RNA sequence: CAGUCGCGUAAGCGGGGCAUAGGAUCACAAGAUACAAAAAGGAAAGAUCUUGGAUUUUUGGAAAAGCUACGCUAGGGAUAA
RNA sequence: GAUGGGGUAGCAGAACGUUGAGUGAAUCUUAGAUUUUUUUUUUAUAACUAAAUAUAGAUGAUAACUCAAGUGAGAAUGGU
RNA sequence: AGACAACACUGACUAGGAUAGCUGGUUUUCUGCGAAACCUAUAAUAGUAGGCAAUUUAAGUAACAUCUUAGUAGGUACAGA
RNA sequence: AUGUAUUAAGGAGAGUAUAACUUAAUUUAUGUUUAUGAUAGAGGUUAUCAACAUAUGAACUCUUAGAGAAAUUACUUAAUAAACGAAGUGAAUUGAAAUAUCUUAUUAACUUCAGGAAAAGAAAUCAAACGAGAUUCUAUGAUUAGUGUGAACGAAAAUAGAGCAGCCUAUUAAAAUAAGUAAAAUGGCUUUAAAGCUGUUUGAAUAUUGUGGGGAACCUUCCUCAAAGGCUAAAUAUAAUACAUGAGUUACAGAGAAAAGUACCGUGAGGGAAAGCUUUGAAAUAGUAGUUUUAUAAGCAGCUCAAGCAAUAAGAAAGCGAGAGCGUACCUUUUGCAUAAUGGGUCACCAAGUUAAUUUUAGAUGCGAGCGAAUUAGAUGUGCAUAGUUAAACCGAUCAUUAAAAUAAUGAAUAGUGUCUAAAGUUAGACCCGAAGCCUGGUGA
């Protein structure tokens, strides 16, 4: 009658609850279902007990190593890119930085120690755009600029993409210069803001370095290269000829 | 249609003033008893204490020396006093403190918020009345009373008439079960009057109404304010990208 | 299938022996791979491939001698008088 | 004019009962609620009919649905 | 004399802190299906693991069983020297 | 049981108006309100017919001067439990299916010292090329990095919350900025090889104008901090008291104790009860009554067949049962038990797959390439999935092996996430009962 005395789950949600050691006709009584008189009745088993037999992880080994030290990239596709600009859930009149890709959902809700933007679905994609992710695939990057659009590659880590997206850190695809002539308007310029913004770090490491000094990913410090200069910062470009 | 209306009455005399409009996913969504359920189990779980306990072999007073003998004395070999085989022993599986609570995604109970609001919108158990909702008192016996002429017995035997009559008046009282009027701030008149006489009714204020309170007395009568406070945290599976939430069709005759 | 060597006029044969009787991991040692390199440049210590030394003979792989008639506990009558 | 029917270890499904809780400020009770019994009926680990005895208006009992378990004992040379 | 050290002494009593691959016990009903005591490994042989495989219920079936017809492998009974 | 508040030395002996508490064992006063309180009488033992608040007299003996066989002696205005804290010392049971390393475990326990808390504390700290900014407590990070042959052990950064406080002129009275120190070899502890602690033998430097320490073997550059001198509340631990709450208990429950560490046992350390009320009265058991059967018979005492007896009366036969036949209790454990194998005198009650964290599956259901959570404007809060591949990165709808590569070959590609119900793996007592023994501290001639 009252609702309240009428509320229930669906039937399907309901289970059988087994309640062992309670009679015979029970089906689980006098026993629980173990047998009798063995160690799997009386005690316990380990469950990494063979009865003996030296488990296959010995015998053969453990495998390889796991990295500690590689990065976790967020891979984002241009199939999934061109989806948002037509929802209408991502501006391709401004320029797509991390803050505006974590902000989209496009990569979900976890922030990784960067993006990674792959070619899943390039023959389809002809939407000029002007992106900067921390690493593309050969496959987007021709993607990118054969719709005539822009793709620049910069330095990031897990804790600059979180200042970003709250709003400490202001994005820049732009190397901080070095060299006593740029002080002065790298000062001002923060004078400007009248607020503690936190500045986005550049690549120490020989890898990361050579990784955004090459042209071929069109990283932020490629600009630094030489037309025949190479991006390693050991190994050169040998010379051909007759001497 | 996907909105439905909602008549705005004056609550002492019942005289619909204004008409608001929400949506049909707010006041006019189907029967859910499922739903329903999960969210009325969900909310007396929260509410238990959880505070039993019962003492282990473990915790049992006394020293753990062994009683008798292993062998040697014919009877049946004991180990410490504080067996569960033993007269005051401990309860090997007895109740303990712990947690009783269960979890239900915030959309999930918000869709059996609104889920019981619709149980009595279509049955006719919500009424909305006009901001300012409090039992019409004499002017005569709240001069006294403030006054102090009038004795805690008189005065709370006066309540518990006037209150009495009241109800059974507009059909309100014990006899057609129960009301529960839900305001948004406490009010003196409707709760002290309530408070006194319990049979008749009942108020409380939005931040103490639960999906359970929503369904146990025969009518809602609720605030203008108080429904659209209501409604508007109790959305979370539908404003995710709005509906119609207080839409006014018909504005009051100023 | 790829690689590149032998024999053969050729077709073709060849990834030891007419067939059936030689144990791993770990650690250690010798070569290769260019993977990662705990701020960074190196390195150390690691990873992958090839290879070597074993009555690891209780040979799916513990570094291991006895007495109790002063004996004790849990069990078996699943094996005795 | 459907098919099927013994069962240990064991696996599985469906239910009853016990204690407490929500609906319950509910429902019923000297025109007899409740009474450890007896009795009657019903495919029935359960409830019900009636009888006898005593006498409560709620610190009483209670259907239905649901929630949670110190939830079901002829077996431990078990314990009191 | 392994004698005595306050019921106990091949090491007392008491409080605190264990395990037991062994033994015993494990409580309501109805319904459906229904084994094994074999192999392999083991410091194993009263134990345990993996199989064979009991159960639940979905997805398949050119499934599985049996007979018929034609075909094939292999050397027992028998018979023989 | 938890939470909140307050407080910060505990017991005993004997005596006394038997609600009244210290030989004064029911002291003497003040103020306010007194039925609209608080939360126009009677009554000094025929008493305390008044509550709140503020004062006040008295308050013995021992623990507790010395001594001693505590509650005595002899003197005198003699007086401080437990638990919690820090350091020092430091096991074994146990697990690894044995066992030494390991684990148990910077554990239990003991000793010293100290306060209401103690300890710790304002970077010779962490990070990584951006930055954070003392200590303490809780959760996540994390069955992670890592260590170990194994079994197992196990961080930090960061995040969230509780609290937040900085200083040397420390709100209590301290430094002329630290040399046998840093550090090394060696023996150990800790541990990842660094850092940190340490016995023995040795033994530096002087500040970003780059001096010293650290950034996990080690060197270097850079960054970061500034030892060998100190002060500091709160959040925390423990105990007592009071209050609040309860799908906590309601007398074999709750606690060991509804009159309890009492009675009683023990030389002793130590062990340690029973017992509520005026209600109800189950079973077992005992003596009778009614009906019925029984002194020719070899019944696990039931089942099948069943004469007869049984209602003072119209109606209504429950029960007991002569006689005939069938049937060797139950459980456990076993190839197999009436077995002369196990267990039980009967009845009643107590008495055994539970809870937590973590990791999974089925069904149901919410949302959906997102899920969940959390939140004038902004930001904020674990996680999982969204792309695979390899030992691994680069790479990427492609990747790996092919010492160059190449459709030459082989393998691997498309809905998740949360909750409930139930069953589960893992770690914890882990379904319940039961050893002999090992270690530490105490007790006793
Ligand atoms: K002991
Ligand atoms: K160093
Ligand atoms: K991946
Ligand atoms: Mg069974
Ligand atoms: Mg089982
Ligand atoms: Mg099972
Ligand atoms: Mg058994
Ligand atoms: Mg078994
Ligand atoms: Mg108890
Ligand atoms: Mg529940
Ligand atoms: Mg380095
Ligand atoms: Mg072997
Ligand atoms: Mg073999
Ligand atoms: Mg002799
Ligand atoms: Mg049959
Ligand atoms: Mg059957
Ligand atoms: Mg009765
Ligand atoms: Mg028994
Ligand atoms: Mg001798
Ligand atoms: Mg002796
Ligand atoms: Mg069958
Ligand atoms: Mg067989
Ligand atoms: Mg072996
Ligand atoms: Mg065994
Ligand atoms: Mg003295
Ligand atoms: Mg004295
Ligand atoms: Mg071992
Ligand atoms: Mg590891
Ligand atoms: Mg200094
Ligand atoms: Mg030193
Ligand atoms: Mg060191
Ligand atoms: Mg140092
Ligand atoms: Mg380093
Ligand atoms: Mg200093
Ligand atoms: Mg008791
Ligand atoms: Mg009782
Ligand atoms: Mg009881
Ligand atoms: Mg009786
Ligand atoms: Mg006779
Ligand atoms: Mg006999
Ligand atoms: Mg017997
Ligand atoms: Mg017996
Ligand atoms: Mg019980
Ligand atoms: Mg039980
Ligand atoms: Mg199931």
Request: avoid cysteine.
């Given at each position: 009658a009252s609702i309240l005395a009428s509320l229930s789950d669906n039937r399907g949600a309901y289970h059988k609850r087994i309640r062992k050691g309670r009679g015979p006709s029970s089906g689980y009584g006098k026993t629980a279902g173990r047998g009798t008189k063995g160690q799997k009745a009386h005690g316990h088993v380990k469950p990494?007990?063979?009865?003996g037999q030296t488990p296959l992880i010995v015998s053969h080994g453990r495998k390889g190593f796991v990295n500690q030290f590689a990065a976790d990239m967020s891979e984002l596709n241009l199939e999934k890119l061109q989806e948002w600009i037509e929802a209408g859930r991502?501006?391709?009149?401004?320029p797509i930085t991390p803050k505006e890709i974590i902000k989209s959902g496009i990569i979900g809700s976890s922030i990784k120690d960067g993006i990674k933007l792959l070619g899943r679905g390039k023959e389809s994609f002809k939407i000029p755009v002007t992106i900067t992710v921390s690493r593309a695939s050969a496959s987007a990057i021709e993607a990118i600029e054969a719709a005539g659009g822009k793709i620049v590659t910069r330095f990031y880590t897990k804790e600059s993409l979180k200042r970003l997206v709250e709003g400490k850190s202001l994005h820049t695809d732009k190397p901080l210069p070095v060299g006593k002539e740029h002080v002065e308007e790298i000062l001002a310029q923060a004078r400007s803001l009248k607020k503690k913004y936190y500045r986005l770090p550049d690549p120490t490491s020989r890898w990361d370095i050579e990784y955004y000094r090459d042209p071929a990913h069109r990283?932020?410090?490629?600009?630094?290269?030489?037309?025949?200069?190479?991006?390693?910062?050991?190994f050169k470009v040998p010379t051909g000829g007759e001497k | 249609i996907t909105n439905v209306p909602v008549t705005v009455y004056?609550?002492?005399?019942?005289?619909?003033?204004s008409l608001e409009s929400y949506s049909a996913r707010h006041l006019h969504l189907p029967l859910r008893r499922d739903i329903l359920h999960l969210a009325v189990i969900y909310e007396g779980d929260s509410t238990r204490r959880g505070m039993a306990s019962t003492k282990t072999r473990y915790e049992?007073?006394?020293?753990?020396?062994?009683?008798?003998?292993?062998?040697?004395?014919?009877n049946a070999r004991r180990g410490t006093?504080?067996?569960?085989?033993?007269?005051?022993?401990?309860?090997?599986f007895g109740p303990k403190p712990r947690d009783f609570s269960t979890k239900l995604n915030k959309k999930v109970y918000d869709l059996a918020w609104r889920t019981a609001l619709s149980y009595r919108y279509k049955r006719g158990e919500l009424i909305v009345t006009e901001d300012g909702l409090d039992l019409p008192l004499p002017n005569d016996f709240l001069w006294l009373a403030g006054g102090g002429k009038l004795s805690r017995e008189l005065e709370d035997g006066y309540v518990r008439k006037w209150v009495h009559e009241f109800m059974t008046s507009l059909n309100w009282g014990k006899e057609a079960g129960r009301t529960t009027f839900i305001t948004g701030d406490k009010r003196p008149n409707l709760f002290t009057g309530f408070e006194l006489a319990g049979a008749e009714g009942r108020a409380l204020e939005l931040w103490d109404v639960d999906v359970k309170d929503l369904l146990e007395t025969g009518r809602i009568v609720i605030e203008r304010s108080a429904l659209k406070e209501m409604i508007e945290d109790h959305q979370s599976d539908l404003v995710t990208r709005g509906p119609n939430?207080?839409?006014?069709?018909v504005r009051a005759p100023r």
């Open positions: 990494w007990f063979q009865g991502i501006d391709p009149t401004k990283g932020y410090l490629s600009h630094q290269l030489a037309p025949g200069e190479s991006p390693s910062l050991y | 004056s609550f002492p005399e019942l005289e619909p003033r049992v007073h006394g020293s753990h020396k062994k009683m008798s003998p292993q062998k040697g004395t014919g006093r504080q067996s569960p085989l033993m007269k005051g022993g401990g309860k090997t939430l207080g839409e006014v069709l």
